[PDB]
Amino acid sequence: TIDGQPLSLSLYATPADPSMLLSAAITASQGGGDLPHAVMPMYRFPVI
Amino acid sequence: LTQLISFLFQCTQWLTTQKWSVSDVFLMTTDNYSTVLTPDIENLITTLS
Numbered sequence: 001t002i003d004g005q006p007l008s009l010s011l012y013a014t015p016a017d018p019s020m021l022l023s024a025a026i027t028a029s030q031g032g033g034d035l036p037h038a039v040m041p042m043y044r045f046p047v048i
Numbered sequence: 049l050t051q052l053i054s055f056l057f058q059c060t061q062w063l064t065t066q067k068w069s070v071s072d073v074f075l076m077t078t079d080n081y082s083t084v085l086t087p088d089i090e091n092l093i094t095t096l097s
Contacts, residue, residue: 029087032094 001007041048063073 027087027091029090029094 063070
């Protein structure tokens with residue numbers, strides 16, 4: 001203008017949106033229990 | 049062409065009604081999945097065995 005102020009208005013850039021935070025549960029896989037060696041005892045079946 | 053347009057429109061409408069994403073429907077409906085041995089799959093194997 002006569003005073004130095006601009007006629008055409010300014011551009012308003014869009015701000016960035018807040019992102020959505022993500023989490024996860026990674027999982028493991030260990031081996032199972034393997035059977036030991038069997039020993040024969042001295043007692044009968046109802047006692048053992 | 050208009051069948052494809054109507055299909056894409058109503059699929060997008062059902063998607064945004066169900067509050068899912070295209071990635072979510074792609075997870076539930078894909079066919080190009082991995083072939084790697086996941087620990088969850090290993091746990092399923094040892095449990096079901």
